[PDB]
Amino acid sequence: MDSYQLFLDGEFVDAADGRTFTTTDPGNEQPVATVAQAGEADALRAIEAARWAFDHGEWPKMTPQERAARIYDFADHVTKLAGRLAMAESMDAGHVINLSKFWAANGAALLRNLAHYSANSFPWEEEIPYSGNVGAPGRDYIRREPIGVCVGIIPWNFPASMAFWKISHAIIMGNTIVLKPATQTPLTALIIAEAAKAAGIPKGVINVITGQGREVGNLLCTHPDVDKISFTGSTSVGNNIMKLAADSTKRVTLELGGKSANIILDDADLDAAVEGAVFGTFLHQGQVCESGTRLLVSSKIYDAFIDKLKARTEALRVGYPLSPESHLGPLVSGKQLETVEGYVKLGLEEGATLLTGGHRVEVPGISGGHYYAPTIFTDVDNRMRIAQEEIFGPVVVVIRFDSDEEAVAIANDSIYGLAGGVYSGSNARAQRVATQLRTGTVWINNYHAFGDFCPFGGYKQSGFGREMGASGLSEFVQVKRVHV
Amino acid sequence: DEEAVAIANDSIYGLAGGVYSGSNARAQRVATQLRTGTVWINNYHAFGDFCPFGGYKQSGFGREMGASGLSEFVQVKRVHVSAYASVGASPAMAILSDDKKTPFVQYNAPTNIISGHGSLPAIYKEMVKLGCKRAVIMTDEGVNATGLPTLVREALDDFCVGVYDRIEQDSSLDTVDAAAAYARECGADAIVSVGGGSVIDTSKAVCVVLKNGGKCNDHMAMLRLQEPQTPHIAIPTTSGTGSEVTNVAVIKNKAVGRKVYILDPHIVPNSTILDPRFTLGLPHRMTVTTALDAMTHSIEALTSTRSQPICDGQALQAIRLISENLPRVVAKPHDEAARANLQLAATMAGWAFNVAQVGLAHAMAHTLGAIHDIPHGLACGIMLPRVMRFNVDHAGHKLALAAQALGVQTTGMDAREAGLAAAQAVEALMQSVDHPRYLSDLGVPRDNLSNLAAHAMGDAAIMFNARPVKGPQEVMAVYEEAY
Amino acid sequence: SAYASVGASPAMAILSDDKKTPFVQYNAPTNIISGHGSLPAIYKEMVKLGCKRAVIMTDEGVNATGLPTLVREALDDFCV
Amino acid sequence: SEVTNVAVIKNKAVGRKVYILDPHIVPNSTILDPRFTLGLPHRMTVTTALDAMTHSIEALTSTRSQPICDGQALQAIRLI
Amino acid sequence: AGRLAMAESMDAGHVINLSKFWAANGAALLRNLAHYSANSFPWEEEIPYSGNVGAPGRDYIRREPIGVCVGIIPWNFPASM
Amino acid sequence: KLAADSTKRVTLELGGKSANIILDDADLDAAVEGAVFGTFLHQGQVCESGTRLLVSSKIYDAFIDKLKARTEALRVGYPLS
């Protein structure tokens, strides 16, 4: 059985006390590997390593063009581990192989693209031709500089992708990052740290610590030597991490969950609309943050849409993640399965009509595993708790409307603002609907259209700040005005 | 000054600061190290409407004034308008379905084709059309020994300013960098490539580097460039690689030991010249290997998941021309018409697989070439029919069309039967034209097949073939069958 | 001359019985978009060409069928 | 006409169709959406199909026929 | 301008030579920021290269107002802040 | 901390202890004038006041006397005067 170690100061080391814990495959409930359990001493060591790498290391001092070559080497060594990363992701987080086989390629492409943009197009120095002050002649210009030590906390939804996002955004701009993966899925961050070590990244730039409980997270958030926290997860934990970081006045970026609405207009193509709705709701068993769990369907096409949606949903195959024939895998843990069952029971109590699913699934040839059938609820009002509270499971609620204004009002009637989608046969009508949605991302006739230069983020209580693009890169730099 | 900087930064606040000095350079050296949101040199309290201000550390966060200040009071929304509104239009949604076909692609072929007897002098006018006056010829030692680059130089006359002949077979990033440096020192504004696929791909990379600057490793991306690159004219000397009309260039990364890609419609050569003089003297082995490489291109393009009727027409016409004219070239080496037909077949096969994309055979051939230095044509030819039989059941009526193009009669037969007949015809042609057929002849050991199969899965050509590759266990089977 | 071969010029074909002139240059730069529901791609094609103000040219018979209305809705704000 | 470089215009003051022939007048892009021909009547369908067939057959026979044009013409004939 | 300067001097203790410019500075700032917003601020921005070849289409950025804002200012520079 | 409970965007502008650095090649008259201004504008109640004055050892003696004289030359009186 494989053994994994913390990545501190450019080397793999055990925990200070030598404690370890075992990860488990959600597909068959078998142990996968043993991972070292970081304590408070290891968190302190990582913080000092990052602080020394920033204050006295060569990483923040070298030019963007010099950082670009190191990032290219890092991306190449990341590509060299594609199969291992995909297999570990499938065995640890439950991603199906058809989904998880692209993670290393996507991460390397993102690294190369962001490094090229930083080295070639990012405005590291910007002029101010007109300062608005005639009594102070001189040269005014803007310098952008790295913030310092960054702490990135990622959830169990997309471990490899989120780790790549955090590491790229932190280190490409010249900062040093301490990465803390989720308790359930720690392997992919360590595998990426292996490529970071192989590529010759300076020591202390990238640190990965894995630990159960929440003492390590509190120590990371409240330490005076940490300059920025980038957190992704649930709203309740983010609202507490922000309170913890408030005591030292440090920059915090929050990416929280959503209850994204998918709108189908009466002129939409029913085949494409059904396919897109099914994809955007049941990709990765509905455990994506931007999942369209609220399906707004026009009254003029409700009857035709419902039957096709039912057939398409029943056509899905649930099986082992490593089997290429599987479309859906298991939930990340038994607690998540119990939460989904509780939400289904609540929805049944509230009076919603259960169209399909709502029960556990036994995968043939496999004993154990957290498998759940995709679930559809109909006759749902927008003020029901199931239409208002995030689930993180393969459950969808269908709500009908009569007009585009009513659809917009229903979609905006939520505390989340992460994403949304519109399906229509006219670009003008879809854009008219989209310009009124109070969400950070709107997809027209598509869903889950990820991009390297397309910023994404949340409105309202879905968080603040953006990732990817110049907007994402600007979160990790300071702004200095110099007057001569 | 270092002590002053250390004292100034020794605080929990980062709002502002000031430096007074008689030298701007010294003051700026002191200022660039201060961890404050605003630094004044020889001034103080210099407020401005477009000058952002704010604090570092425990002086707060965020900025006021300027675009930086105005950006604090706006949200950012990303809107994506899909180009297609149909089921199956996106490869990403194919994960949750048993059907993997993705037929939605956009077709383009802007290359200006020049062909015929004595068509080389047309390069003199093509240079004027492209607005270029300083061309540098890119070639290699083997082609330079035959005297064809001398013919190209005489055709260019005063538009040629240099010749670079140091391009090596299986070129790398350093070869591209050296060629780009040599082209830049000569003040080139256009690149003329005379050679095989390696020379043409290296010239594409050299054009990208010349246009954008930097190093070759910086530009290894997919669909990133937004504007036309340095003008490029390709003059192939092999009877098929297709590289004169494709948008992809493959470069070896010696520090990684892996062939990297650059894929962009803007790296397609502006023009190409199909003069039969450049292939009249080609030996027998090169002729048969390049013809079989073109045949593999056309057959794989007819079978891939992204096959389109235009690509089908190109592939079928190329297959017909190759089948009709390869025996004529083998028997009658300086038959000019057959050489021209082979060149046109190669160009059309390149057009076909530029859009339809290649499958597993090229994924195998690339690893074979990267590890054992095996030429591309032999590797493609020896694995074409085994890949055909490998995909014989998931390929539809396409293989029947290929068999009809080769000449095998298919007035009535099951799709399996027609697919097997097509591979039988391909093997018949291969044996008729003196083509090598087994990997044992070229020195690959039996045991290294596991490592080769493992290295095969890392290529991007997978997931474009008709049959999805479940893992290395099937690549093992095909490699062993090829032994 | 762009060509140095016999039969390359149509003018010299006057003094010969053979009239074939096979020397031409081939080009096809048009970007082909096709498939079910491929009309929305015009919105991105307008951005690729660097245009923002398109005018639809049609006739009465086609305009009566409502296809130009579909094109206008696809163009949205790029149609003037 | 969506991919050709020639445009034919009638000159009413002369009563003769005049020509403009240039590679730079080729359309930059075209959209082949089946919605734009799904409602075409029978007479228009057969006449346009026969016009395309005439194009392909004449191109295969003219004095300037080339193998690329031959492939295009043959594929078009087969599809029609 | 005169009323604002007099009130600032009497309320916050600013000397008249300092407080006599507050209204002019505020109006100039308002005009400059309004002109920049109307003419140069990127309210709509294109994304020519999204980094995703599997999702063709038009990507662009819309910038929109946040909503209700609360501004708390200290006694240092009341009018300017 | 109060705004954390509803997850709303917060921008903070807090105080400072800004340092004013005088190098040995600086012009002593201009340096003294600038230091006095940047420290005593509005009685030092500006957020960006340079309350920490870093002076090189090579020019300390000459700078201190001029700074003392310039500071004692300041007049304190009614704001409206």
Numbering used by the authors:
A (entry chain C): 1 to 484
B (entry chain D): 404 to 886
C (entry chain A): 485 to 564
D (entry chain A): 646 to 725
E (entry chain D): 82 to 162
F (entry chain D): 243 to 323
Text lifted from the article:
Looking into the cross-section of the BdhE tetramer’s electron density, we found that the tunnels where substrate passes were connected between ALDH and ADH domains. In an AdhE dimer, the linker of ALDH and ADH domains filled the gap, while the linker of BdhE formed the elongated loop (loop 2 in Fig. 4a and b) and thereby remained the gap. In BdhE, however, another BdhE dimer partially filled the gap in the tunnel wall within the tetrameric complex, suggesting that the tetrameric structure is more effective at preventing intermediate aldehydes from leaking out than the dimeric structure. Importantly, the RMSF reductions were significantly larger for BdhE tetramerization than AdhE hexamerization.
Here we present structural convergent evolution on fusion enzymes of aldehyde dehydrogenases (ALDHs) and alcohol dehydrogenases (ADHs).
